[PDB]
Amino acid sequence: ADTIVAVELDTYPNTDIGDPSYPHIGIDIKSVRSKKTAKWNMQNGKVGTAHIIYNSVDKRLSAVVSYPNADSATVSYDVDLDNVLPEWVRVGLSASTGLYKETNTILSWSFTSKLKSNSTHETNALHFMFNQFSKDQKDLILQGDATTGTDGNLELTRVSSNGSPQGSSVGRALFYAPVHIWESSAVVASFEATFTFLIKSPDSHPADGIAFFISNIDSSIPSGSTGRLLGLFPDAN
């Protein structure tokens, strides 16, 4: 199947599969069952910010999610990506809804990757920044229900003409070009992704979340990965 690594912003508690009983952010390594989580005071209707960072020196993946003039939620995990991901991967954003829904709007997204090879200051780097998405974003691969264009935002899951989120929806957006994430002799390898999201829900509790992910190049949405599976995993193992 696919090799996935993701930082999820889980809005709905699925205790039946490991989710702590409250909204949270977590780090998933090839499984929707987070290796580590942290409480997250999600705020319906407010624009938030997510910051993911990683460096080959510490081999520690960390994430920060916060809202203006509010507290932050943090989560870290020691992991050696060399032994988890292939050296060439694709990066993207994923989201979904199930019985309950929410809007999974991305207002901006940026990514930076640097690979310092073992040679007198020989760095390879990639950097892209999206502050507004157009109707025809050719440098992005949209999968599932993902669409771009309205208000210049990226709507990961289905939204009605009036603006109401729809249930049972999956969507993903991957940056077109492959990303050289690691190398056998890289003195230092690191990357940092950032994105602002706006999650709104009309019904009671919202679901199911947004996730930043790294996968094999030819990855695609698994069948039935709506709802609790965040469009990332085929099953809950």
Binding site: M42, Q43, N44, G45, N69, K200
Partner: peptide, 10 residues
């Protein structure tokens, strides 16, 4: 801020 579950900053 249309509204939101277990919420509100100050």
């Amino acid at each position: 801020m249309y509204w939101y579950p277990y919420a509100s900053g100050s």
